[PDB]
Amino acid sequence: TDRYSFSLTTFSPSGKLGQIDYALTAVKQGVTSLGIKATNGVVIATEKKSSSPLAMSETLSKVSLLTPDIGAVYSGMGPDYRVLVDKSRKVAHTSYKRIYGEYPPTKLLVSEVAKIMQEATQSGGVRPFGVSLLIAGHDEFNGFSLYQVDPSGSYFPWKATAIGKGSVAAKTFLEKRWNDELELEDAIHIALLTLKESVEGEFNGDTIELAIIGDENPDLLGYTGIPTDKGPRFRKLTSQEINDRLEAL
Amino acid sequence: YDRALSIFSPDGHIFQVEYALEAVKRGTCAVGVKGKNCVVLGCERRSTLKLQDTRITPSKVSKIDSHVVLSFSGLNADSRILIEKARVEAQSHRLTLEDPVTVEYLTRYVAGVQQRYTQSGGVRPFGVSTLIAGFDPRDDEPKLYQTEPSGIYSSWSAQTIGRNSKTVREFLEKNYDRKEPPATVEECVKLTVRSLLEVVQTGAKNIEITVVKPDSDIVALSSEEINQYVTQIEQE
Amino acid sequence: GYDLSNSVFSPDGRNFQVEYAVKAVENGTTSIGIKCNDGVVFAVEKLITSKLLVPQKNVKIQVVDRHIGCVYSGLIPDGRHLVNRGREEAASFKKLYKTPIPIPAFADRLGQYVQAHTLYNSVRPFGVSTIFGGVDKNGAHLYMLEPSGSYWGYKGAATGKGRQSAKAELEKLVDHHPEGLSAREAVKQAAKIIYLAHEDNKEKDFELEISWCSLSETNGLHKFVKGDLLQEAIDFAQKEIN
Amino acid sequence: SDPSSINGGIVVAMTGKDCVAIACDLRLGSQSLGVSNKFEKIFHYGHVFLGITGLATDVTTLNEMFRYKTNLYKLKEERAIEPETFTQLVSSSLYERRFGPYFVGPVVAGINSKSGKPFIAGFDLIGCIDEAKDFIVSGTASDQLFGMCESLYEPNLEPEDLFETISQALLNAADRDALSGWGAVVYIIKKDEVVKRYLKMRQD
Amino acid sequence: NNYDGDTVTFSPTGRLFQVEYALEAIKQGSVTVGLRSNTHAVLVALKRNADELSSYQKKIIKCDEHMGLSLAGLAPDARVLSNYLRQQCNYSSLVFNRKLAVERAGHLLCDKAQKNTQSYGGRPYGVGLLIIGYDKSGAHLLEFQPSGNVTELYGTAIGARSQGAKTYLERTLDTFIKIDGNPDELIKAGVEAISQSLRDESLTVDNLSIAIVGKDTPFTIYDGEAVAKYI
Amino acid sequence: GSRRYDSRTTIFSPEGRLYQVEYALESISHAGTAIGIMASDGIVLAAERKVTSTLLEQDTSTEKLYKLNDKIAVAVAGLTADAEILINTARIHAQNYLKTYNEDIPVEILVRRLSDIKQGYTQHGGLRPFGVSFIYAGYDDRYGYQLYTSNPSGNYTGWKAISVGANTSAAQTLLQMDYKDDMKVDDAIELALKTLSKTTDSSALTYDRLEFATIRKGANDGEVYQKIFKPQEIKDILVKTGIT
Amino acid sequence: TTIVGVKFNNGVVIAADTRSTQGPIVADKNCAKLHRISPKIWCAGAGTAADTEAVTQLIGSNIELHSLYTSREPRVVSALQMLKQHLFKYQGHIGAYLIVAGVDPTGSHLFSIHAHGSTDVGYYLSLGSGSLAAMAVLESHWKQDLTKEEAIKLASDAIQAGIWNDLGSGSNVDVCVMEIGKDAEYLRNYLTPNVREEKQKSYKFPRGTTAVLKESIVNICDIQEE
Amino acid sequence: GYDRHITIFSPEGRLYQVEYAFKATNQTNINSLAVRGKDCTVVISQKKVPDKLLDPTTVSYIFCISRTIGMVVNGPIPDARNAALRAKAEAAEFRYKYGYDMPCDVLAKRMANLSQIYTQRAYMRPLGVILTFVSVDEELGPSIYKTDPAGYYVGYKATATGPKQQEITTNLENHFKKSKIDHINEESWEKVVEFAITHMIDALGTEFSKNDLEVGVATKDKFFTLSAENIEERLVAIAEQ
């Protein structure tokens, strides 16, 4: 049968939808991840944790690509994000690659993903996902943007933000380092320095995942010879390069 | 989803019916009196708070036809759905069968909406009681019915539903005859007014009067028209 | 707590609804299966609750395909439905690939099916263990299927109240023939250990049924045992227990 | 027969320098009866203009289709849709129908306010982005237009040289079309203000 | 309310409790007794009126001229099974130009009930059937439990005080099988069998309802002053 | 089971009242204030955010204000997240009216529709309602400017001025005492700001905590031009009314 | 049109023309007929134009997904396989005559695919209406194991022959060279063999040489404050 | 409470129902060990046959999903066959629509999503088995991916499973710290089998037989299983080292 079509999100007798509050707790049990928005790029960073010392963090992806020019990174539950990134990609393709053809604006896509969060707080047999996403991107219309998607199904633009267990400390860190004008390089230094205080293990560049949605790079597209068309503004930094960056904090 | 909200109660009742009738008590209050040449449905309008426009506050009396109206007591949210559904059925009769609707037709239709959600599981019925009033075309007899969210209908010749229906009923016992309605429209209007001034209160602010006369005559009377009648009532 | 559905799980790592279903078959009939070299021999104890019954009319042995024997114990209506589904599976395979389904293939499919009803609170599990086997071009096979959805290879298997009595004798029978043994001789064996597992059913009386699938006699089809061969087996088992 | 060529209709469009122009005839008929001398085929969403040719009913049904979609874009992003993204949209929405497909040709003309450039593109029954920086024509006398346009055109026109050109092309084609004629209107599109000018034309 | 409010939950006793409750409908319910020889089958049912100004209720349903069923439990549950058996029997005549066999119709019925007890929100049917019929194999007499399981007998009973009726049939067991070609004797013996099931429910000529099927006899229900040939 | 894990959430109570709706009104009082006032030249929508953080960008936050169509906008008070779904349903219903009738949707119709969805959640499906309250600014040609407030139960009530969100009591009374029916857009712009500064959840009302928007009939020909002000223009008008 | 694809040991070259005809009417002088299923997987299209363009849009999305899922270079035959199945159930009512080219870490590849859902391999393939004219010239000069430069030429010349003996082929010849283990090199307008001859006088007129009926202004630049 | 009975969060943000799924793979007492060789990937795993009356040849914890990808399962056997089936369907699926055999990486990711979907419903029981996929791919080289009930997966240099798998893990970690590369060097896959056995014997403290082991080997473009005889050959070669 099917008798689970009663929502598993409810209100509490003291107001405040209780289920999404619990789901927001799981983010404070999650890993720390942060995004600093520059005025000529965006940087996102997260820490890799595994349950084994024989585990490969070379086939572990916590920063994932949605479209060349837009990246995402989570804090919270792994499994939840693993399915949710696939649904983000799927709606972006079915509604903006088969209808509007080109890669969406950042603002558009953020709204669309928040609708799926919303539709896991409406129906039975589904309770919501317990991660928060930072979706960094650039469109040529609204410029650089950094957004944060809630487990409530809302979005917020931020100037700089963190999510994870060390989020509260991190936004206090960013207060004094932040400035309305930043370079992309300086952003890298600020981002990794804040995340060093939100990791209580050892802080390597082999176990720290770095990505920029900063400079275009054409040769990562797959072809060259038309410069009006580029390749990905997303660019993941390999490990040895990140090690160079640890020295640049 | 089919996990019932309608579940048999140990008294030969259903939880959702009993609750629906509670919601009718707690809600707006409608009085219906029929003359020999009219129906009057008056209902509590909710505008008690100060600085409200009453052209965009919910209609408590809605015309379904050119001579059949629908009034209600109970919740104010559950009721709009039924208004919309009644209109469709009226237009359907007129499309496929012909003949501006009869009041009786619509009385049974509204009760037939109540029965579905009671007897089915996974749904709950509307907490709305209705006064269905009007005329049959080609007949000059006015007709006053009530339906309640149980799905029952009964004819009356005066009726009240909603808050303090006991109070309103007792007033109408001495000043109304079951076998001789009013013979004048103005007296039917004034009798419905006198009942609403018991519970509702506070002038003619929250009073409504809709009048239907035969020949397909619907008029709505604004509150300022009702003031004039009220002063005569007090003087008397 | 943890005893109200089949999609709770305990901190112990145990599902009790599912475990509890094995107890259903434990109050069922005794049924045995001897894995041979040429085939398989099933036998099933049929309890007699009165003498108004008509013996060898009340079937627990249903054939699935033209070559797979199935006999089951536990809650009877449930087991008849499990066989019901499996006949549909037989026809489907035949339709697409134009050959009768193999013995391992059938075992596979039933395992999936019994899995499905312990994964939802909207269907009820089964209450039967089934014993089935046969001959195909990969050889003779024997399988027992739990209501958990578990099966294995089986040299010999049993279930029912007297599964203990049965299995103890099967161990000794592999001592007698560590090279396995012939189907034809295993008919007499099959009776023997139901009589031994009727010493746990010794406040009742019984009817013996035997069925076989063997490549050396019946040309690899599943048939019943009856007539002269049957009464030879009945006589054998009697004298031994007397 | 074929439904496109019942009412007729032509649309002509030409690029200039940091401007575009789109123009149409006003004739909408059913078959040999001329019905209306007062109808436009040019619509606008934002600052992008859509001229549509072919079958009458599908002219109007697509007008409404695109109005739903371009409202969405706007209310979202708080601004006007770009000519390039409107191109992509038009293509896909034609392909939605394959059985009883569309029997039109839309024409997209605007100015990209992102690089200052003229953009036009063309479409036929089901799609096919027609890229040009010269002119795109469509409709039933598309041949008459194609010839006329090539000869008069010179790369890079000023907005008034451009008015002259597109007008001449339209007139002679429309009076050499049986299903066009009745009046004409030309939008000359600059990026700050658009002038809409009716042409005096033979009544035919 | 753990395992008795759900129809999907086991039970380390290897039960579903609902089935036992559905078998208690038979104790409160009517009684009917079947017995067969090798050439005829017979049902003797105790009809019961609602009061004395009520006609007594028919308890035997004719499914075909070679088949009949009788209830002892809830009537609305019996209404589903009567339709189903008729449907399958007519289907057998249409498709295979066959009578439908007795054993086989029981098997179809068994697996039907099972998948409505499987589905959550369902119910096990609380009516027990005796299904009689005459096919090529001769007579058959099946007992149908609320479990759904079918059993083959020469004589069986269900309902209230069915236990005494099986005593009676086990004693006359070798008598009525070695009477063949006379359906009459079986009916007399069946009256005696259901008299071991009375509680001052008396047997009259309008309480007694007989149904037979033979090789040469259609399915026929005797009622009226025509059951007083066997009293 | 499946009836074993449901306690029945969306039935009536013994006062005829839906558990979930009553809880919802409380959760909307947690969320920031939003006030609507109707001038005889316009409607002013003014909203205070429910979140203001250390480094929250609120300079482009369009997270309370949404244009449903080019004459109807809403102010949001409640869960921003919950509100999303109905905001886009409303866009679709509005565009549909334009598509088939070649005319802009009346305010009445659009609100009545959304209310039906809310009513629909407790009517069927076992589903909860969205804990949202909306204040609608809308223009039509039949009642002119219309002002509406809607609640999570699915009912609409007209107003001349109304408040939702946090501290509705205080705000409502002050609005009654100070509002006159001959006010302008200028007057209403100042009245809204003063009311929001008596209900500010901090100790001061700041330009980046204000979203401010108007629908004005000063645009030519009597057309209504909706304006969602830039963050420098809100700061501009807030020093004018003399809060900061 | 004409599309040539020449496979050789070290890579593959796909070349096409830029003349877009609808009917005998030339839709476009210039148009890019090289399309992108994926950034390494280029094709060009002949036959009807809308159908080629649509199906490469549709399969471009599916492949783009797949490329993200593996996070590495998409295989050519993935595109091949998906096109084939798609077209097969329409039974070729969708006219796509594609030459599908691409490189990947299991070698150089070159395929053709028809409307019905037929696929061929070859070390060179040609499709469209001008395929025939291209063929001849290729088969004389072609060798096993061409140089990349040599292959460039031979491709461009084959399209050139299309211009001269086919009426769907014309204006510009573009080439894309895809080599294993590098980036695809898009050589737009590699050979421009035809200019519009010069005219002898310019076509200006003074104003109002066309009559004008009336005029109005029409504003889209925004909406209005007061 | 009842956030521990269905998969809905607690005031910690934790799904207790999901955590329990891990706790059941110790109940069959099966250990596995899988290491990447030089040109192969070897997985050796326990085989429990507690009786005669179980036929040992049939007792298999090794299911071939692809031609090239083996799967070894630790935990309850119903869920093992269920998981194997889903995975087999999906592998075939991808071969049909993408024109090559499904990558090991992508198959691991696939089962991770499906696992998450079984914890997304509130009446679906997570599949409690822990799955090891071993392959030699032509793009990723030797690979091990271990997926788990929650729907988390990550690549692996080597891995172990079972109630006693900490000990095994300790051994392997130390080996790759001396060697300083992520795969064992040798050059005959046979000797990588032998090495794997030695570490296993050290870890669990018990020497194994040819019917206490069942061995699977993936070389290039292939997966097969060793028979019980081949395994006895290896145990002689322990003597020979």
From Swiss-Prot, chain B:
UniProt main location, coarse: cytoplasm
PTM annotation (Phosphothreonine): residues: T57
Record keywords, A-Z: Cytoplasm, Nucleus, Phosphoprotein, Proteasome
Cited Gene3D superfamilies: Glutamine Phosphoribosylpyrophosphate, subunit 1, domain 1 (3.60.20.10)
PROSITE patterns named among the record's database cross-references: PROTEASOME_ALPHA_1 (PS00388), PROTEASOME_ALPHA_2 (PS51475)
GO aspect biological process, one term: proteasome-mediated ubiquitin-dependent protein catabolic process
Misc. remarks from the entry: Present with 16800 molecules/cell in log phase SD medium.
Quaternary structure and partners: The 26S proteasome consists of a 20S proteasome core and two 19S regulatory subunits. The 20S proteasome core is composed of 28 subunits that are arranged in four stacked rings, resulting in a barrel-shaped structure. The two end rings are each formed by seven alpha subunits, and the two central rings are each formed by seven beta subunits. The catalytic chamber with the active sites is on the inside of the barrel. Interacts with CIC1.
Function: The proteasome degrades poly-ubiquitinated proteins in the cytoplasm and in the nucleus. It is essential for the regulated turnover of proteins and for the removal of misfolded proteins. The proteasome is a multicatalytic proteinase complex that is characterized by its ability to cleave peptides with Arg, Phe, Tyr, Leu, and Glu adjacent to the leaving group at neutral or slightly basic pH. It has an ATP-dependent proteolytic activity.
Similarity remark: Belongs to the peptidase T1A family.
Gene from which the chain derives: PRE6
Swiss-Prot record, chain C:
Note: Present with 12000 molecules/cell in log phase SD medium.
UniProt protein name: Probable proteasome subunit alpha type-7
Keyword annotations: Acetylation, Cytoplasm, Nucleus, Proteasome
GO cellular component: nucleus; proteasome complex; proteasome core complex, alpha-subunit complex; proteasome storage granule
Family per record: Belongs to the peptidase T1A family.
GO molecular function: mRNA binding
Post-translational modification: The alpha and beta forms are probably products of the same gene with different post-translational modifications.
Cell location: Cytoplasm; Nucleus
Role summary: The proteasome degrades poly-ubiquitinated proteins in the cytoplasm and in the nucleus. It is essential for the regulated turnover of proteins and for the removal of misfolded proteins. The proteasome is a multicatalytic proteinase complex that is characterized by its ability to cleave peptides with Arg, Phe, Tyr, Leu, and Glu adjacent to the leaving group at neutral or slightly basic pH. It has an ATP-dependent proteolytic activity.
Superkingdom of origin: Eukaryota
Gene designation per UniProt: PRE10
Main localization, broad class: cytoplasm
GO BP term (any one): proteasome-mediated ubiquitin-dependent protein catabolic process
UniProtKB/Swiss-Prot annotation, chain D:
Taxonomic source organism: Saccharomyces cerevisiae (strain ATCC 204508 / S288c)
Subcellular locations according to the entry: Cytoplasm; Nucleus
Main localization of the protein described in the UniProt heading: cytoplasm
UniProt similarity note: Belongs to the peptidase T1B family.
Record keyword Ubl conjugation present: yes
CDD domains named in the record: proteasome_beta_type_3 (cd03759)
Function: Non-catalytic component of the proteasome which degrades poly-ubiquitinated proteins in the cytoplasm and in the nucleus. It is essential for the regulated turnover of proteins and for the removal of misfolded proteins. The proteasome is a multicatalytic proteinase complex that is characterized by its ability to cleave peptides with Arg, Phe, Tyr, Leu, and Glu adjacent to the leaving group at neutral or slightly basic pH. It has an ATP-dependent proteolytic activity. This subunit may participate in the trypsin-like activity of the enzyme complex.
PROSITE patterns reported for this sequence: PROTEASOME_BETA_1, PROTEASOME_BETA_2
Record's subunit section: The 26S proteasome consists of a 20S proteasome core and two 19S regulatory subunits. The 20S proteasome core is composed of 28 subunits that are arranged in four stacked rings, resulting in a barrel-shaped structure. The two end rings are each formed by seven alpha subunits, and the two central rings are each formed by seven beta subunits. The catalytic chamber with the active sites is on the inside of the barrel.
Keyword Ubl conjugation: yes
UniProt keyword terms in alphabetical order: Cytoplasm, Isopeptide bond, Nucleus, Phosphoprotein, Proteasome, Ubl conjugation
Highest taxon of the lineage: Eukaryota
Swiss-Prot record, chain F:
UniProt crosslink position (Glycyl lysine isopeptide (Lys-Gly) (interchain with G-Cter in ubiquitin)): K99, K198, K230
GO biological process: proteasomal ubiquitin-independent protein catabolic process; proteasome core complex assembly; proteasome-mediated ubiquitin-dependent protein catabolic process
Keywords: Cytoplasm, Isopeptide bond, Nucleus, Proteasome, Ubl conjugation
Disulfide bonds: none
Any single Pfam family the record assigns to this protein: Proteasome_A_N
NCBIfam families linked: PRK03996.1
Similarity field: Belongs to the peptidase T1A family.
Its job: The proteasome degrades poly-ubiquitinated proteins in the cytoplasm and in the nucleus. It is essential for the regulated turnover of proteins and for the removal of misfolded proteins. The proteasome is a multicatalytic proteinase complex that is characterized by its ability to cleave peptides with Arg, Phe, Tyr, Leu, and Glu adjacent to the leaving group at neutral or slightly basic pH. It has an ATP-dependent proteolytic activity.
PANTHER family named in the record: PROTEASOME SUBUNIT ALPHA/BETA
Cell compartment(s), UniProt: Cytoplasm; Nucleus
Keyword Phosphoprotein among record annotations: no
Protein name listed in UniProt: Proteasome subunit alpha type-3
Miscellaneous comment as given in the Swiss-Prot or TrEMBL entry: Present with 17100 molecules/cell in log phase SD medium.
Keyword 4Fe-4S: no
Assigned GO CC terms: cytosol; nucleus; proteasome complex; proteasome core complex, alpha-subunit complex; proteasome storage granule
